[PDB]
Amino acid sequence: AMTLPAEGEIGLIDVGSLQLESGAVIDDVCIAVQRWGKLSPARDNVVVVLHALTGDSHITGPAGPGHPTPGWWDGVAGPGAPIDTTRWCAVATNVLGGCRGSTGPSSLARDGKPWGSRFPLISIRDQVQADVAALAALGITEVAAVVGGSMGGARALEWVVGYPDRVRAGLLLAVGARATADQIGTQTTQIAAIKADPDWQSGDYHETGRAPDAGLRLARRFAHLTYRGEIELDTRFANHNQGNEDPTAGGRYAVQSYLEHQGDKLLSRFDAGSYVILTEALNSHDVGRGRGGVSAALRACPVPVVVGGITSDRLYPLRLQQELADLLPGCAGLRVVESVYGHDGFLVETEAVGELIRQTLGLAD
Amino acid sequence: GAMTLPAEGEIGLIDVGSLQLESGAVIDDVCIAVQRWGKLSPARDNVVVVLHALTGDSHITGPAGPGHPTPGWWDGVAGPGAPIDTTRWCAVATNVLGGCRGSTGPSSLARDGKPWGSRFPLISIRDQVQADVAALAALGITEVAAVVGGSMGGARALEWVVGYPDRVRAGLLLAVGARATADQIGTQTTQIAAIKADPDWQSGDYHETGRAPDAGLRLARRFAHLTYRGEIELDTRFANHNQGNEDPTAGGRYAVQSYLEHQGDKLLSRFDAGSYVILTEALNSHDVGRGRGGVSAALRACPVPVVVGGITSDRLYPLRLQQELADLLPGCAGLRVVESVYGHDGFLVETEAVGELIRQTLGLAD
Ligand SMILES: [Cl-]
Ligand SMILES: [Cl-]
Ligand SMILES: [Cl-]
Ligand SMILES: [Mg+2]
Ligand SMILES: [Mg+2]
Ligand SMILES: [Mg+2]
Ligand SMILES: [Mg+2]
Ligand SMILES: [Mg+2]
Ligand SMILES: [Mg+2]
């Protein structure tokens, strides 16, 4: 019954208490939402856009006051765009556990203090439950489609599997049916780097004026390597030095300066507690849990879907998307995005990803 | 040089004296630890140098025990009828300059009686080869039959055959590239940053303080171990399963997580954080083309017969790097592909395939 925010603006949707997969109960949850395009009278034209690990609800448009980053899928929603806002209403949330409007470790609880270590562990399924509740509070009980890559693709997968009667189509991009050992390996070690930072303070650094900046930077540097293509990295930087710096005398290599810059950029806009909470959700991703395993769960989902994967992806290798396309009966076949940019192709390959979105919405109309 | 090799299997300490490094910096009183298997020939022309990788040592074969925290890292490679057949060859292995298993490195004591620590100069792969060559010369060995190595040992072997082509008859270059790649430098410099960000790093002078950067070294090793493994095999072995009866939701661990923590603990008990930094910086500086007109010119001008091998599932030194070496080194008859699910670690695990590469190499040396 709540009203959508004005186009482009952030709305804060109270969804109340949620029972979580761990057994924990979290009260007074708030989900930030942005939308583009008008809602149809039947409220049946919503396209939910699901952001990745460090993304937010700002899917398109420039950076500015209230938006540290530009649209992470800039141009995806608009007149004549892949999500054509003359027909569709693009809606994006800030995920549960995030730090740009939705309830997370850095958010203030009802006592005026950050949740901090009081914030419970959440799953991808918990994130979907919270988004579904936020849409329901807005009078939206069915969506035309859900689209997302990376962690967004995991949210989309659990949405189509968990609510097959309430979504007409999905795009699953650069994701797998469950977390893999390699993903869990790098992800748990990323968390360990943050927790080993002496300023982590058991997750309750928020009020102390100290923060685990060194740990968060290291986590992001290792993560960024998993997001890139091996060949393109060497084509861009090789073993060259940064500018006129001398690595044998305290200077940096070019790829090293680049990685340091990636760490600095994240620190300026993202919370370490959110990084930990959301990476834990990645670790527990498993569409098969409680549903008889991965094959049984996918084979029983009748939702039409487009599945896309990136050739050079080193974090979510193409074999994971081939499995999704082979097992989901609503998938006509894997769509292969050839890209040199690795996992990050799901953000950079604007033309190819735009076409996957258009194909997805074709299955929902 | 007229020192003698230690008794077989036993560690010998070779005084090579002061070395002038590629950078121009000088390091005094360098000691190189050595072990060997097999008798030396009267002409001293049957030496096969086995070059260990980042955290290896001179103990290439044999069990663990007193003085040896780890068993032979290429166990079985040297012996009667083995790939290095000690009825014919003398297998010699050093601990690399900058190491922590007998040779001079950051934890060694300098002339002033204090550990080198932050005073240890940055070294290159070429400096490592210079030291090994000097150690052999002190033993009266001026030419070697062959050099063999994988990973950082392959980088040492490559700089040996390119830098001393008249003093080596053949080389095995396994799971290595002509220069460090951007991806390698990326993970390597971040591993170093993790160690240096540890509060107990103490600018590299933690030695003898009672505190050491254990957390940073564990983290660096965990990330490195992932680069050493095969993606599919890791998931076949561990998948997303919990460790034993633990629950990650309630403080437990995932199976692959407990596995990685154990790799960290194992390295901690036998390896020094300062050595990890110095040797990783030598990997960052790896570039056979430097001062030689670039990679193509350097490789095309090296006439040494070589066997080049690469591992199908290697994610750290991808096969394209060994294709490049095999295409440019005129002494290479063609790339040898090692089929393995175990990633870069296949160069340690695929004993049969690697043993055949060594035999091929030694066939080029007689
Ligand atoms: Cl609770
Ligand atoms: Cl190693
Ligand atoms: Cl070149
Ligand atoms: Mg989960
Ligand atoms: Mg399962
Ligand atoms: Mg199918
Ligand atoms: Mg070097
Ligand atoms: Mg160069
Ligand atoms: Mg050739």
Author numbering:
A (entry chain B): 8 to 372
B (entry chain A): 7 to 372
Task: Quote what the paper states about this structure.
The three solved MetX structures include residues 15–70, 77–372 from MhMetX, 10–379 from MaMetX, and 7–372 from MtMetX. The catalytic domain comprises residues 15–181, 297–372 of MhMetX, residues 17–183, 304–379 of MaMetX and residues 17–181, 311–372 of MtMetX. For MtHTA and MhHTA, Ser157, Asp320, and His350 comprise the active site; MaHTA’s triad is comprised of Ser160, Asp327, His357. MtMetX and MsHTA both contain a small helical region (αL1′); MaHTA features a unique pair of short anti-parallel sheets (β1′, β2′). Interestingly, MsHTA is as good if not better an approximation to MtMetX as either MhMetX or MaMetX, suggesting that it may function as a good analog in assays where MtMetX cannot be directly utilized. However, when assaying MtMetX to determine its viability for crystallography, the Tm was found to be between 40–41 °C by differential scanning fluorimetry (DSF) between pH 6.9–8.5 in Tris-HCl. Because of MtMetX’s relative thermal stability under physiological conditions, we have chosen to focus on MtMetX when investigating future drug development. Using the MtMetX structure as a guide, we also elucidate the druggability of the enzyme and propose that it is an excellent candidate for small molecule drug discovery. Of the eleven CS identified by FTMap, eight reside somewhere within the active site tunnel. The closest CS near the catalytic Ser have S = 19, S = 16 and S = 13.
